[PDB]
Structure formats: structure tokens, C-alpha cells
Amino acid sequence: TQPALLRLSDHLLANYKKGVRPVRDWRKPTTVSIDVIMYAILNVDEKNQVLTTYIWYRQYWTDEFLQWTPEDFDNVTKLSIPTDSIWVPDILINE
Amino acid sequence: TQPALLRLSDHLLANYKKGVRPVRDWRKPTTVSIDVIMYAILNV
Amino acid sequence: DVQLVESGGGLVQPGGSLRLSCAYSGSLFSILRMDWYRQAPGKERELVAGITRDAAGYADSTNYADSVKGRFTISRDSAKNTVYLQMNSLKPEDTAVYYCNADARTITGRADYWGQGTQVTVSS
Ligand SMILES: *[C@@H]1O[C@H](CO)[C@@H](O[C@@H]2O[C@H](CO)[C@@H](O)[C@H](O)[C@H]2NC(C)=O)[C@H](O)[C@H]1NC(C)=O
Ligand SMILES: [Cl-]
Ligand SMILES: [Cl-]
């Protein structure tokens, strides 16, 4: 048909359960490549011994369920979809 | 079939009502073992 | 894995002009640097032109070899996903196979990618 990329949006997210980790083989681990950029050191607290900073953070991973072929989708490469509509890693900071 | 663990996640959470306490016998209490680690005393 | 496709190569008389196009494609990639290379029969690989964004994150910065210093001009179109090489006053010594080398970063990591290259023959 011809609604274009909207089709894609359906096709991927139709039965997609965002609770299960996106791997066809459960034994296969999902690798998250991360990136940290220091924007500013906001404040150091010498008394309470606590540092407050601002970071630009980048997360890259592989969603094995959200894969498709560019063809028969009008040669679409990438698609912008809501963050909270897909599985997301729970990476945090210990400090 | 072969969607793997995706099946499991469904099978468990299909009719799972998160409001009722998870016990087959209502007389049976749910025991919660807890653990506490002190990371920092922020302020007194 | 980003794929590169060269095009525009052909036969031209000396002193003429020819425009080469290199089209990149893939899934998730970031072209950090794009170089043009040429290889004459028997001769080594020669660096022709390159392009990379400046320290200021707006205007680009080109890099030319002493050979093609004045004749060649490398440009790009992010919208058309294609990097161009404008060859003016072609010499018979400029005759070679022109590849394009893209230093791109993917989910796998930072790596170099090469195209199939196009034949550029300058003869009378
Ligand atoms: C999607 O991309 C493919 C490849 O980039 C296009 O197919 C090319 O263009 C025409 C086909 O209409 C042919 O002359 C070329 O030889 C094809 N090349 C290859 C490598 O297949 C296709 O047309 C594009 N489709 C849309 C809708 O954009
Ligand atoms: Cl697989
Ligand atoms: Cl029981």
C-alpha cells in the first residue's frame, strides 16, 4: 500500500512487547555502547563530599525485534519512535 | 513454537493480576527477605 | 557496514572536466572523514582529496594533495547522501581508477570503508 513509513511504524510496534529484552536467542546478551560528555561542573560540596555535574549521555544498543528490510518500505533507513514505547536498559550510576 | 523467552513473558503475565497477593492458598503468608547496605550518611 | 558506490567516471579529452560522485548508504553510521583515492595501473594508491567538519561544528574543511591542488574540488551533499569530486583541466596523468574511502563509525566501531571505484581515462 501507500501510507508510507506509517506502515513501518505499525509493522514493528504491532505486537512488540516492551517488557521482554529484544533478543531472538535469550542466551545472547544485549550490548549497550555508552558515551559521556562533560558539559559543566555545577557544584562541588567539600563538606558533604558530593559532586554535582551535568552530562550529555548517549546510549546505543541492538533491538533484535525492531529489524526490517529497507525495501518494500520505500527504502526507509531509520525511524523515530517514542522512547517509552520500546525496551530500555536500566544502566545507572553507583555514586 | 520458537519465539523463545517471549513466550514465557506472555505465558506468565497474560492473566496475571498484579492487585492480588501472589499466593495459591490465601492462608499462606508471603515472606519478604530484605537486605540493607549503608552507602553514605548524607546529613544529620 | 556502510556501502560506498562511485559513479560519474568516463572518457574525457585533456583539459576537460568531469564530476565524480560517491554515494554512502547503510543503517546506523557516522562518516567522520571521506577521502578520495586514485590508483593508476601499476602505480600505488594516491590520496586526492578529503573533507571533514572543522573545529567549529558548522563549516567543513577540505584537504587536497599538491598534485590536484588547483584543479580538483571536493564537496558534499548530506541531503543527497553523496560526496562529490569536481575535476577540472584533466591531465593524461590523472587517468586512473578512483575509489572513495569513508572513515565511519557504526555500532560495531570506527572503521574504514571502500567503494568499487570508477574508471577515469583521459586520452586524445
Ligand atoms: C530503492 O533503492 C534501490 C537501490 O538503491 C533502487 O533501485 C535502483 O534504481 C533503479 C530501480 O528503479 C535501477 O535503475 C537501479 O539499477 C537500482 N539499483 C539497485 C542497486 O537496485 C530503487 O529504485 C529504490 N526505490 C525507491 C522507491 O526509492
Ligand atoms: Cl539471530
Ligand atoms: Cl502449595
Q: Which CATH architecture has domain C1-124?
A: Sandwich (2.60)
Q: Find chain A residues with C-beta within 8 A of B3's C-beta.
A: 24
Query: Could you tell me which of C94, C75, C77, C93 has the C-alpha nearest to residue C85?
Result: C75
Q: Which-ligand-closest: CA of A25?
A: 2
Q: CA dist C67 to B34, C6, C50, C116, Å?
A: 74, 21, 14, 23
Q: Which-ligand-closest: CA of A74?
A: 1
- Identify residues after which chain B is interrupted (C–N over 2.5 A): none
Q: CA dist A65 to A17, A87, C42, Å?
A: 10, 10, 48
A50-60 and A33-45 strand pairing: antiparallel
Residues A22 and A63 sit within 8 Å (Cβ to Cβ): yes
Q: How many CB atoms lie within 10 A of CB A61?
A: 15
- How many A from CA of A71 to the centre of ligand 1? 9
Rg value, chain B, Cα: 19
Q: Look at ligand 1, atom 23, and give the residue with the nearest C-alpha.
A: A75
Rounded Cα distance between C111 and A67, Å, is 23
Query: Could you tell me which of C13, C42, C33 has the C-alpha nearest to residue C101?
Result: C33
At residue A5, the 3 state secondary structure works out as: helix
Residues C98 and C48 sit within 8 Å (Cβ to Cβ): yes
3-state helix, strand, coil in chain A (%, to 5): 15, 25, 60
Q: How many interchain CB pairs under 8 A, A with C?
A: 9
CB-neighbour burial class of residue C6 (10 A; exposed 0-12, middle 13-18, buried 19+): buried
Are C28 and A78 a contacting pair at CB < 8 A? Answer: yes
Rounded Cα distance between C65 and C75, Å, is 15
Rounded Cα distance between A43 and C87, Å, is 55
Rounded Cα distance between B4 and B9, Å, is 10
Query: Could you tell me which of A13, A18, A59 has the C-alpha nearest to residue A36?
Result: A59
Q: Find chain B residues with C-beta within 8 A of A24's C-beta.
A: 3-4
The number of the ligand 1 atom at minimal distance from the alpha carbon of A74 is 27
- How many A from CA of B20 to the centre of ligand 3? 17
Rounded Cα distance between A65 and A24, Å, is 8
Rounded to 5°, the CA angle A24-C27-A60 comes to: 65
CB-neighbour burial class of residue A38 (10 A; exposed 0-12, middle 13-18, buried 19+): exposed
What is the arrangement of strands in the sheet containing C72-77, beginning at the earlier edge strand?
Answer: C3-7, C18-25, C82-87, C72-77
Query: Could you tell me which of C8, C101, C89, C109 has the C-alpha nearest to residue C46?
Result: C101
- How many A from CA of A75 to the centre of ligand 1? 9
- How many A from CA of C38 to the centre of ligand 1? 27
Strands (E), chain C: 3-7, 11-12, 18-25, 30-39, 45-53, 60-64, 72-77, 82-87, 96-105, 110-114, 118-122
Residues C83 and C34 sit within 8 Å (Cβ to Cβ): yes
Neighbours of chain C (3+ CB pairs under 8 A): A
Structure determined via: X-ray
Q: Calculate how close chain C gets to A91, using CA atoms only, in Å.
A: 18
Q: Calculate how close chain B gets to A29, using CA atoms only, in Å.
A: 13
Rounded Cα distance between C37 and C30, Å, is 20
Q: Look at ligand 1, atom 5, and give the residue with the nearest C-alpha.
A: A75
Residues C117 and C97 sit within 8 Å (Cβ to Cβ): yes
Rounded Cα distance between A75 and A93, Å, is 39
The number of the ligand 1 atom at minimal distance from the alpha carbon of A71 is 1
Q: Which-ligand-closest: CA of C26?
A: 1
Rounded to 5°, the CA angle B13-B17-B23 comes to: 100
DSSP 8-class letter at A83: G
Provide the grid cell at C11: 572518457
